[PDB]
Design an enzyme around this catalytic site. Structure first.
Site, PDB file in Angstrom:
ATOM      1  N   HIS A 159     -18.399 -49.074  40.270  1.00  0.00           N
ATOM      2  CA  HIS A 159     -17.513 -48.815  39.135  1.00  0.00           C
ATOM      3  C   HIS A 159     -18.269 -48.348  37.882  1.00  0.00           C
ATOM      4  O   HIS A 159     -17.679 -47.692  37.021  1.00  0.00           O
ATOM      5  CB  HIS A 159     -16.582 -49.997  38.832  1.00  0.00           C
ATOM      6  CG  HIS A 159     -17.213 -51.097  38.033  1.00  0.00           C
ATOM      7  ND1 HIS A 159     -17.639 -52.283  38.601  1.00  0.00           N
ATOM      8  CD2 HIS A 159     -17.439 -51.206  36.705  1.00  0.00           C
ATOM      9  CE1 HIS A 159     -18.105 -53.074  37.650  1.00  0.00           C
ATOM     10  NE2 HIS A 159     -17.995 -52.443  36.488  1.00  0.00           N
ATOM     11  N   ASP A 214     -17.669 -52.527  45.822  1.00  0.00           N
ATOM     12  CA  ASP A 214     -18.213 -52.159  44.488  1.00  0.00           C
ATOM     13  C   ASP A 214     -19.735 -52.142  44.471  1.00  0.00           C
ATOM     14  O   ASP A 214     -20.393 -53.066  43.962  1.00  0.00           O
ATOM     15  CB  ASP A 214     -17.636 -53.099  43.424  1.00  0.00           C
ATOM     16  CG  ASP A 214     -17.856 -52.580  42.006  1.00  0.00           C
ATOM     17  OD1 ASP A 214     -18.250 -51.400  41.885  1.00  0.00           O
ATOM     18  OD2 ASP A 214     -17.641 -53.361  41.045  1.00  0.00           O
ATOM     19  N   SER A 274     -21.899 -55.849  34.111  1.00  0.00           N
ATOM     20  CA  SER A 274     -21.555 -55.203  35.381  1.00  0.00           C
ATOM     21  C   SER A 274     -22.698 -54.419  36.006  1.00  0.00           C
ATOM     22  O   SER A 274     -23.483 -53.755  35.304  1.00  0.00           O
ATOM     23  CB  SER A 274     -20.372 -54.257  35.212  1.00  0.00           C
ATOM     24  OG  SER A 274     -19.159 -54.983  35.310  1.00  0.00           O
ATOM     25  N   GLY A 275     -22.805 -54.491  37.326  1.00  0.00           N
ATOM     26  CA  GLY A 275     -23.842 -53.697  37.991  1.00  0.00           C
ATOM     27  C   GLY A 275     -25.167 -54.444  38.120  1.00  0.00           C
ATOM     28  O   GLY A 275     -25.996 -54.093  38.928  1.00  0.00           O
TER      29      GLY A 275
HETATM   30  O1  H25 Z   1     -11.113 -54.702  33.448  1.00  0.00           O
HETATM   31  C1  H25 Z   1     -11.682 -55.766  33.142  1.00  0.00           C
HETATM   32  C2  H25 Z   1     -12.197 -55.902  31.731  1.00  0.00           C
HETATM   33  N1  H25 Z   1     -12.980 -57.127  31.615  1.00  0.00           N
HETATM   34  C3  H25 Z   1     -14.309 -56.898  32.188  1.00  0.00           C
HETATM   35  C4  H25 Z   1     -15.212 -57.887  31.481  1.00  0.00           C
HETATM   36  N2  H25 Z   1     -15.653 -58.979  32.367  1.00  0.00           N
HETATM   37  C5  H25 Z   1     -16.576 -58.761  33.299  1.00  0.00           C
HETATM   38  O2  H25 Z   1     -17.066 -57.642  33.499  1.00  0.00           O
HETATM   39  C6  H25 Z   1     -17.041 -59.921  34.123  1.00  0.00           C
HETATM   40  C7  H25 Z   1     -16.793 -61.303  33.980  1.00  0.00           C
HETATM   41  C8  H25 Z   1     -17.445 -62.025  34.984  1.00  0.00           C
HETATM   42  C9  H25 Z   1     -18.155 -61.174  35.793  1.00  0.00           C
HETATM   43 CL1  H25 Z   1     -19.133 -61.669  37.224  1.00  0.00          CL
HETATM   44  S1  H25 Z   1     -18.070 -59.494  35.450  1.00  0.00           S
HETATM   45  C10 H25 Z   1     -14.395 -58.482  30.338  1.00  0.00           C
HETATM   46  O3  H25 Z   1     -15.211 -58.419  29.158  1.00  0.00           O
HETATM   47  C11 H25 Z   1     -13.168 -57.579  30.216  1.00  0.00           C
HETATM   48  N3  H25 Z   1     -11.836 -56.797  34.027  1.00  0.00           N
HETATM   49  C12 H25 Z   1     -11.299 -56.624  35.314  1.00  0.00           C
HETATM   50  C13 H25 Z   1     -10.252 -57.399  35.815  1.00  0.00           C
HETATM   51  C14 H25 Z   1      -9.699 -57.152  37.082  1.00  0.00           C
HETATM   52  C15 H25 Z   1     -10.218 -56.131  37.890  1.00  0.00           C
HETATM   53  N4  H25 Z   1      -9.640 -55.853  39.133  1.00  0.00           N
HETATM   54  C16 H25 Z   1      -9.862 -56.623  40.225  1.00  0.00           C
HETATM   55  C17 H25 Z   1      -9.270 -56.340  41.433  1.00  0.00           C
HETATM   56  C18 H25 Z   1      -8.422 -55.251  41.558  1.00  0.00           C
HETATM   57  C19 H25 Z   1      -8.203 -54.467  40.432  1.00  0.00           C
HETATM   58  C20 H25 Z   1      -8.831 -54.774  39.230  1.00  0.00           C
HETATM   59  O4  H25 Z   1      -8.627 -54.062  38.193  1.00  0.00           O
HETATM   60  C21 H25 Z   1     -11.268 -55.368  37.371  1.00  0.00           C
HETATM   61  C22 H25 Z   1     -11.795 -55.626  36.112  1.00  0.00           C
HETATM   62  F1  H25 Z   1     -12.818 -54.911  35.653  1.00  0.00           F
END
Ligand code: H25
Ligand code: CA
Ligand code: CL
Ligand code: CL
Ligand code: NA
Ligand code: NA
Lengths: 234, 44
Positions: free
Chosen positions: A42, A88, A185-186
């Site tokens: 992603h 991912d 991320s990543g």
């Molecule tokens: O889009 C976000 C935005 N968040 C991403 C950030 N959090 C993280 O990246 C993490 C928290 C814990 C970890 Cl490990 S990575 C937060 O600051 C805000 N989160 C999120 C939620 C759900 C999600 N998701 C999961 C399954 C199917 C579809 C789908 O969209 C993807 C996603 F990036």
């Protein structure tokens, strides 16, 4: 990284940082070898053009050991989709090889069957990155690390708004305010076994950061050990 | 069995036959072949 601690010198040497055309970090990675970085598929969508910085612990000060590398080949899992966030994973081949040194060294890739029985069954792993230090806040200018417990897959499924697949696993805390966050991320999730660190996960996604009743979701690297090996020989 | 003390292996264990990550050689134990073997924190 929300909570946790700053990485001391030499403590998180497999951390890589993907930087965009603004020279700002937007995602992490894991050093696998002189030529290969592991990251999340992603992440590739966030910047058309990016480079990799290794050896950095403080993005506000240029310090000894930092180096920048261009990416020659991007290998993104063909089944990744934003619809599910499944698969991912991506591997980056660098144009030039990394020189290992203080703060710059690879994490070990485990053998699959052994990793499933012996690493995934440990109590905790370590996640690191330059991400936000609070859900609504700014990205850290210092490299941070956090020990996260492995979380039962069924508890995680119950907690999650979204489908948790066999290519994911969950880690972190129900209510304690410690988690990865935007920008992490990543990056690496590694698990120690007898004084050696093995890469077990890629920071993938979460519903916010450190939310009560939510966990962090990681790409399960054991599911892709053969895919990684094939990619690093391509 | 690898199910008991990892077969005494320092890293990998299969059926006992031990293995090490690339960059290490089997001594049970695994021996680093360079100053920056994988999975090791670095010292000055
Ligand atoms: O889009 C976000 C935005 N968040 C991403 C950030 N959090 C993280 O990246 C993490 C928290 C814990 C970890 Cl490990 S990575 C937060 O600051 C805000 N989160 C999120 C939620 C759900 C999600 N998701 C999961 C399954 C199917 C579809 C789908 O969209 C993807 C996603 F990036
Ligand atoms: Ca720096
Ligand atoms: Cl599944
Ligand atoms: Cl969110
Ligand atoms: Na467990
Ligand atoms: Na939580």
């Amino acid at each position: 990284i929300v909570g946790g601690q700053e990485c001391k010198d030499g403590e998180c040497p497999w951390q890589a940082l993907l930087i965009n055309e603004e020279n700002e970090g937007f995602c992490g990675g894991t050093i696998l070898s002189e030529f290969y970085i592991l990251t999340a598929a992603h992440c590739l969508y966030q910047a058309k053009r990016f480079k990799v910085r290794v050896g950095d612990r403080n993005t506000e000060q240029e310090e000894g050991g930092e180096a920048v590398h261009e990416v020659e080949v991007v290998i993104k899992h063909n089944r990744f989709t934003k619809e599910t966030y499944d698969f991912d994973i991506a591997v980056l081949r660098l144009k030039t090889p990394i020189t290992f040194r203080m703060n710059v060294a690879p994490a070990c890739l485990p053998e699959r069957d052994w990793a499933e029985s012996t690493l995934m069954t440990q109590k905790t792993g370590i996640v690191s990155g330059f991400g936000r230090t609070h859900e609504k806040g700014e990205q850290s200018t210092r490299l941070k690390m956090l020990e996260v417990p492995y979380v039962d897959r069924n508890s995680c499924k119950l907690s999650s708004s979204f489908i948790i697949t066999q290519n994911m696993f969950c880690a972190g805390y129900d209510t304690k305010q410690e988690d990865a966050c935007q920008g992490d991320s990543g990056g690496p999730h590694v698990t120690r076994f007898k004084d050696t660190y093995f890469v077990t996960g890629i920071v993938s996604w979460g519903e916010g950061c450190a939310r009560k009743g939510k966990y962090g979701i990681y790409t399960k690297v054991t599911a892709f050990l053969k895919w990684i090996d094939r990619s690093m020989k391509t | 069995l690898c199910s008991l003390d990892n077969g005494d292996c320092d890293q990998f264990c299969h059926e006992v036959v031990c293995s090490c990550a690339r960059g290490y050689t089997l001594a049970k134990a695994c021996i680093p072949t360079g100053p920056y073997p994988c999975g090791k924190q670095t010292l000055e």
